[PDB]
Structure formats: structure tokens, C-alpha cells
Design a binder for this molecule. Sequence first.
Ligand code: HEM
Ligand code: HEM
Ligand SMILES: CC(C)(C)OC(=O)N[C@H](CSC[C@@H](Nc1ccccc1)C(=O)NCc1cccnc1)Cc1c[nH]c2ccccc12
Ligand SMILES: CC(C)(C)OC(=O)N[C@H](CSC[C@@H](Nc1ccccc1)C(=O)NCc1cccnc1)Cc1c[nH]c2ccccc12
Lengths: 456, 456
Amino acid sequence: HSHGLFKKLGIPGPTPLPFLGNILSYHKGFCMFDMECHKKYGKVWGFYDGQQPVLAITDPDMIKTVLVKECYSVFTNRRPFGPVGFMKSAISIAEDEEWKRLRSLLSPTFTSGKLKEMVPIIAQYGDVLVRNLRREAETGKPVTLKDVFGAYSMDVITSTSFGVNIDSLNNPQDPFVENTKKFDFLDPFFLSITVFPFLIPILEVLNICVFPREVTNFLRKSVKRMKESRLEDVDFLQLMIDSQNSHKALSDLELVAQSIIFIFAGYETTSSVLSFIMYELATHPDVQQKLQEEIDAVLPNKAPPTYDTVLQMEYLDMVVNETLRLFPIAMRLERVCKKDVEINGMFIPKGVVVMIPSYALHRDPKYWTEPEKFLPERFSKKNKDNIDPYIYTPFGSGPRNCIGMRFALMNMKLALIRVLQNFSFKPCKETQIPLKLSLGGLLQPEKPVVLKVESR
Amino acid sequence: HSHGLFKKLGIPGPTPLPFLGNILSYHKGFCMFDMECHKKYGKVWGFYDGQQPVLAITDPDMIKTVLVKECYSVFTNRRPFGPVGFMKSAISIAEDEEWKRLRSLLSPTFTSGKLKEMVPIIAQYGDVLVRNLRREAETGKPVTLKDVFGAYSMDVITSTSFGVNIDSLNNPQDPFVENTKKFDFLDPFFLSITVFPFLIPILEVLNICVFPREVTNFLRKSVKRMKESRLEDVDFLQLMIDSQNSHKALSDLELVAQSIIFIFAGYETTSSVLSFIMYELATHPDVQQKLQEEIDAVLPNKAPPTYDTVLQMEYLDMVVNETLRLFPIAMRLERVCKKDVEINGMFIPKGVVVMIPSYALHRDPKYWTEPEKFLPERFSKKNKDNIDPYIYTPFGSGPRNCIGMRFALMNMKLALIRVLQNFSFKPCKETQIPLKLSLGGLLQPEKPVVLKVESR
Ligand code: HEM
Ligand code: HEM
Ligand SMILES: CC(C)(C)OC(=O)N[C@H](CSC[C@@H](Nc1ccccc1)C(=O)NCc1cccnc1)Cc1c[nH]c2ccccc12
Ligand SMILES: CC(C)(C)OC(=O)N[C@H](CSC[C@@H](Nc1ccccc1)C(=O)NCc1cccnc1)Cc1c[nH]c2ccccc12
């Protein structure tokens, strides 16, 4: 029906089947399709997620236009997603003037000023991590990183965001811990979404929420207790409540929505990435040692890390940066074109979803040498300059980039510094080498990362 | 020529003489003209500063529209002022997109976060004040407040904004001190401006600057030394340099311009107001004692004040608030209407300067009882609620309000707490009672405030 679009424009792509579009091509997962598409077709191509035209662009002047130059005018929202229900107000979801309000009202949550105030707390759980890690290191049992990293990152969220302090590895079943741990695209549901996006309004009317209709009701209330327990008697909720004291302040259920996408991401990104990094440290043993040295020449005597010294560790930075090059958990960035528009000499008509294929661009040999080896020296202050910030985009770019970037980078670095101060990480046999990525829809490993840990 | 405007609109006012407009009416100073005009004419009137129509509005729904609701759309800039030269870029001066850039790029200079970081410094000079005050208190010589307060506030600026630490009362002639101390409306010049505003372009072409063409050249350079002396080896300049590291960063001479209007205001407002307050404490002896008690029940043993406890002193707040009611150093707020527009049912045509007569409204019996007595209980948490924030406007309102409000309130409170911890202030004979305001163009006293100081 609407499949003629790129045939007209003179824009190339894979021919789309009726109804499906090009979705059968995701049997290899988004990343492989993107990569293949980049090389078969070059710098611009089109496909159809159902009847939804998606235009993939790989020019960094053009990417800059979409992510930064013309964000407010044309390319302000991401792809409609559903059913959400009361999570329509979550910032990552919200659109246009509702977004801009929330982004403003939630921006100073992550300033150098407030990020630095959170450092002492994100400390006390790095220590909890060591002790939970040493019990697995004096008992030579290979360690599922995501698990031990998960509970750590989880401990950081509840703390950085509500107060609630839990040894979540130890209290894996505390009511605040169950809820919070709780399929995403490429699975039985969202493929149907993309083929039956007309069926989304069906469920919105049904209180059916992708976020299960129960985890929400736990934290909706648990907040308005906390709300009514410190009021009256440092974290994200606190920082959000003071802000509803221009625009229109912050409504009550809008607060619970932003908390949820804060609890995710702080959990699943931070812990997912720390395992990609630790897998990389194990499989490239020289880098781990180089880092363990710098960690120690800044913080001698296994010294506890601080704000200013974490930004002082450069090899630490380069390692994180390079792990994210190889695993940009986002994979793609996306904005809905809201007007007939022409950027850098190309007509983009209304409603086209515009897509930047991060994962593919991070592995493009046209910009990276040996792009699949793990080469942390790419990010040296010698070579960091020669890197197009519109090709390397692990946090997006522009006014709709990741709001948690600074906190995310600091969360993970405070982990590694503590964790590399006391242990070293060797591979095991059941350790997956080389790591295989999930054929699914998420930048996650086929098999969880298991490594051997050793006390120093 | 253009004097028919309010005669048409059906808007009332004093009939304007040719060329002059209504300026001869300023022989009683703006405030008295505003007050008289409010009572002769009511809620809306017009006059002509030369050929410049000025519409004075006293309705707080309408004031809110002009200062907050429609700031960005219609009422975004203040009255053209000149000649300025390179001070065209100073934020208080700049217009529209240049302003909004600078206001954004200079906003997080004054956050709770950064304001709190400045508290320890604004301390060490409160102490310098005591010792400079005790030399005048063990030597019973009546004290010119503006002088001792001036050097204090001056000490705070150079410190809060560059580093340079001077005992300016002691070093009254240090090169950084002379410059920085350096007629404003109602004097031989600006009256000619308002009658010959066509002659402003004349001087702009002449490097003639109201800011003398020399003080600027001192600080322009003194900065690019400091710029090139900490780079590389907490204050306003530092906070401004890190910010040029969306929009278009911060250009180099734009930095010097914002520094100048920072050095003023931090000097002349802070010290001007502290003398209005201390004059008031002397002439109303009961309030001074009430305050000296609360200052001591928060900070016992002449304890040094801190951030959180300054916001804890409520009678301190009420006193400042009420002094500003009686002396709003601004007197008037103003915005240039940039479109034919209709707010709250009144046509305002392009180019009309829109004026809110703060001083008059703070003394309006229609909103204030005994509005001229000094009654600090007006601002009690019992009665503070019954106060239209669009009548009481010592810092303006809305997106173009005073950016230094929080710092100003905290600067002055840290002064009074220290100064009232060690001294009490009695009037003298040559002390002007009742204070007379300058017939001139500035909210300043006819005669400087002299009081008797006594050690405790
Ligand atoms: C390694 C950690 C993380 C990575 C790689 C990451 C990556 C991203 C990316 C690529 C985007 C979209 C950028 C764009 O569209 O241009 C994004 C958005 C976002 N991220 Fe993160 N993120 C991380 C962690 C976090 C954390 C800890 C938070 C904390 C709450 C957070 C909050 C958000 C939000 C709210 C958005 C939506 C931005 C918006 O739509 O306004 N992220 N993230
Ligand atoms: C008792 C102290 C002060 C009072 C009563 C005061 C009052 C005001 C008022 C009424 C305005 C205009 C508001 C409006 O147009 O709606 C203003 C503007 C401004 N004030 Fe203050 N002010 C004070 C101190 C300061 C201080 C210490 C600074 C520090 C640098 C400062 C910086 C500014 C700036 C930059 C503007 C221009 C705002 C703009 O045009 O964007 N002020 N002040
Ligand atoms: C942004 C549109 C409207 C197109 O659809 C999405 O909302 N997005 C998708 C689906 S639900 C996003 C939500 N997830 C979440 C999942 C379970 C429980 C609670 C929340 C979210 O905001 N998590 C924050 C986050 C995650 C990763 C990195 N940083 C921040 C997922 C998504 C993939 N990458 C993103 C980048 C930004 C925003 C969303 C996503
Ligand atoms: C705002 C327009 C463009 C209409 O003309 C002015 O720029 N304004 C007038 C004249 S020069 C403003 C400048 N003074 C200054 C004087 C000598 C040396 C350096 C700077 C300024 O910005 N000082 C900051 C300030 C002063 C008082 C309270 N807070 C902040 C003066 C003026 C009276 N009340 C204001 C309120 C806001 C901005 C300016 C003024």
C-alpha cells in the first residue's frame, strides 16, 4: 500500500513484502541487518517496519542536522511506542511540549554539582560488591557478572533515587527488589505491534500496559509513602519533589513515571555494560593490567576513589569508551520527521522514521580500523580527536541525548575502580569466547558472562 | 508629532509638551511622578519620555501577562539604552536571541548548588567587616554606612567573581579598587538622551561610552591575565569560562561585558540596601533587638552563620523583604512591546514601552496598610500569603527577573548576621530622620546614612 515511497524518492532498499515490510530480515537481529544494509546500499537506504517507512542515514553532517540542528523544528520525537498507559508521561516517551517541560524540569538532576553529591553514596555499595565478590573468590566458583553487577547497580538506583538501602544480592526477595527487576522487541509481542500498530489503540483502551499492570502499582504507592514520610522528617525523588515546589511544575503521577524509567537504565544499562567491560578485561589480559596500574597510581593503597580522581583516570575512560563502541546498548537512534523537510539536499516527507544505525557505524571499517578487535588506544588523547562525534554515538547527541550520561559513566567507573582494586578476572572454560550477541532485539549476550575472579 | 497616541487609544495621562513630553515632571524624581500619576489617573495611564510613549500598568493579572505570560512573544526587551558600545552584549542590555543565549549560558552560575559553594568565602569578609567596624566603635565616631558596607560588598564581588582579595576599605587605592568603584539618569546627560535619542547613534559611532572608555579597558585585560593565569594553574569568572568549554558557547569580550554588570549591582545594590536596612534597624529600635535575638537563638555564642541556617532565620527574611518594599532600588520595571498586541482587553501598539511602577505599587494604600511605616510583620508566615507577587516586585518577575536574586539575598543576610552579632546601631544627631530620598534618578538617600555603632 504505502510501500512505494522509497521507490518514488529514488531512495534504495530491500524490496518489502506485503504487510510485513522488511521484518523477516530481523531474524538476524537489528544489528546484522543494519550492517549488511550499510554495505549493500551505502549512505542512505529505506525499509518498512510494517507499513512504517524507516530511512537510515549514515552521513555525519546529516546526522548532526537530525539529532542537533533541527531537533526542535522537525525531528523532535522518537517512534510511537505502545501500549504505555500512564507511562505516556515518562520523559523518554513523551513528545514535544510535554517532553521539553519534563526535560527542563528533570535536567538539573544530573549536574556536575549534584552528580558530585552522589559520589559518597555510590561508594558504600562498591564496598558491598567487594565483600560479595570475595565470597565467590575465596570459593573458586566462576561468576555470572550480570548477577553480581546487577544487584550492585540495583543497589545504586534505590539509593540514588529513593533512599531504600538493600543488600539486594543478599536480599534478592525483599519486596522492593522483586518488583524492580521486572522480553523487549524481536519477541512474540512487538513484532505483532509493528504489523498491527492499529491494534495498539486497542490495548490502550484496555489498561493493558507493556509495563505489567502490577509492578507500576507497587512503586506508585511506595513513592507516596516516601513522599509522605520525608515530608516531613540527596537522591533523584528528592530532587524531583523540590522541583514541583516556569512551565507547570511536576504533577504527582508524572513523578512515578519518571522514576520507573530511572530505575530501569540505572539497572539494566549500568550492569549490562559493566559485564561487557569485564568480559573485555578478561579476554584482553594486558589492558586489565594497564588499568589496574593506573587505578593504583591515582589511588595508592587500594585507596577509595573520589569524583575528581575518576575524571583523572584516562585509561579508565578509554576502556569504557571502547567497550561502548563495540556494544552500544542502544544500537539505533531514531526520530520521527514531523514535516515535509529537506536536510542536506534530500526530501524527507512527513511521518518517515529517521534512523541512525549506531551499532553498524561503530563497526564501519570506513571510520574504524580493525573495527572488531578491542583496541582501547583508539580513545587516547592522541587519537580521541580524530573521531566523528556523529559516528560514535553511544548516548545519542543533541537535545534528546541520554540525560543520564554523566551519572552512567560515573556509576560504572566507581564500580570498576573498586572492583579492580581487589580482584582480577580470568576467563573460564564455559566462558563464551568469542562473545556471541543475542540474535534477539537487545544488545545483550547470547550466554551470560562467567569469569574467574581472584583476590589480590 | 507622535503625542496623539494615548489621546486616540482613549488612554489617559498628563498632556505632553512638544519635544520634551512629560519630562519636566521628573523634577520630583520618577517615584513621586509615578505615585502622583497612579492616584490622579488610576490603573492605566500614559506619558511621553520625549517622543517615546510609555504606558504604566498597575493590574497584577496584566503585569503577570507582561512579565511572565508573554515575555518571549511580545515583551522581551527593556527600553533601548545608549551609548553602550561593547556593553551591547551585557545580559541586562542584550535583546532577544542574544539575551536568551546569555541568560541560558549564565543561569547555573547562581544555583542553590553554586550559591552554597560561595558561602564560606562571603564569610571571611564579614569578619574583615567586624574588625573594620570595631575600630570605629571603640572610637565613637558616627559611621557612614554606605562606605563600610560598600567596601564589604566590593570585597565580596572581586572574591565571588575573580579571586582578587583586597581589604578595600584598607586598600582604597589598590588599582583593582579605584576602577571598580566607577551620575545615572535625571542628571545632565540622560535627560538629553530622552530628548535627543536620535543622537545616540552619533556617539555609538564615536567610541563614546556611558561606561567611561577607560575603566572597561582595565578589566578587559585584567581578565585575560586571570584567564591566562589559572589556565593553567569557585567564582563567577571561573563559572563563565567553564561554560564556553547548545547555542554558541561564550565569546571572549562577551565575558568581560558580563563581568562588569556583575561587579556593579554586587557592589551598588548590596551596599545600598544594607544601609537602608541598617538605617531602618536604628530608627525602629525594637526590630533590631528582635532580630539580634533570633540571630542568636540560631547562632549561639556569636556563632558563624551558614547556608542552611540563613534560610532558617525568618525575622531576618521579613526585615529584608520589608526594607525592599520601601526601597525597591529598581523603582520601575519596563519592557518594549514588540508587536501590535492586546493583553487583558487593551490594545498596546508596537514600540510602546510598558512600565510597572514598583516604587509606587509598594506604597499603594490600596494594597498596603500604613504603607509608609516600617512594619516588618507584613512578611510573617501568617501574612506573607496575602501579598500579590505582581505588586511586590523588588526583583522583577518572570524570565527576565533579577538573575542575582538568590545571591543578593544571601550576600546581605551573611552581612547582617555577622554585623548584628557584634554591634548595635543607634542614630546620631546629624543622622537624617526621616530619611529623604534623592530627588535625582536613583533610589539612594539625599544624605548618606550615618549611625552610632556600639560593641557588644
Ligand atoms: C551506559 C549507560 C547508558 C547508555 C549507553 C545510554 C544510552 C542512551 C541513549 C543512546 C539514549 C538516546 C539518545 C538519543 O536519542 O539521541 C538514551 C536516552 C535516555 N537515557 Fe540513557 N543511557 C545510559 C544510561 C542511562 C541512565 C543511568 C539513565 C538514568 C536515569 C538514563 C536516562 C535516559 C533517558 C531519560 C533517556 C531519554 C532521553 C530523552 O528521550 O529525553 N540513561 N540513553
Ligand atoms: C538587593 C539586590 C538586587 C535587587 C533588588 C535587584 C533588582 C533587580 C531587578 C528588579 C531587576 C530587573 C527585573 C525585571 O526586569 O523584571 C534586576 C535585573 C538584573 N539583576 Fe538584579 N538586583 C539585585 C542584585 C543583583 C546582583 C547581586 C546581581 C549579580 C550579578 C544582579 C544581576 C542582575 C542582572 C544581570 C539583571 C538583568 C536581568 C536580565 O535582564 O536578564 N542583580 N535586578
Ligand atoms: C523512545 C520510544 C518512545 C521510541 O520508545 C521507547 O521508549 N524506547 C524503547 C522501549 S521503552 C523505553 C524505557 N525502557 C523501560 C523498559 C522497562 C521498564 C522501564 C523502562 C526507557 O526510557 N529506559 C531508559 C533508558 C534505557 C536505555 C538507555 N538509556 C535510558 C527502549 C529503549 C532503547 N534505547 C532507548 C534510549 C532512550 C529511551 C528508550 C530506549
Ligand atoms: C535594561 C536597559 C537596557 C533598559 O537599560 C539598562 O541596562 N539599565 C539601567 C542602565 S545600565 C544597567 C547596568 N548598570 C551598570 C551601571 C554602571 C556600571 C555597570 C553597570 C546593569 O545591568 N546593572 C546590574 C543590576 C543593577 C541593579 C539591580 N540588578 C542588577 C540601570 C538599571 C536599573 N535597574 C536595572 C535592572 C536590571 C538591569 C539594569 C538596571
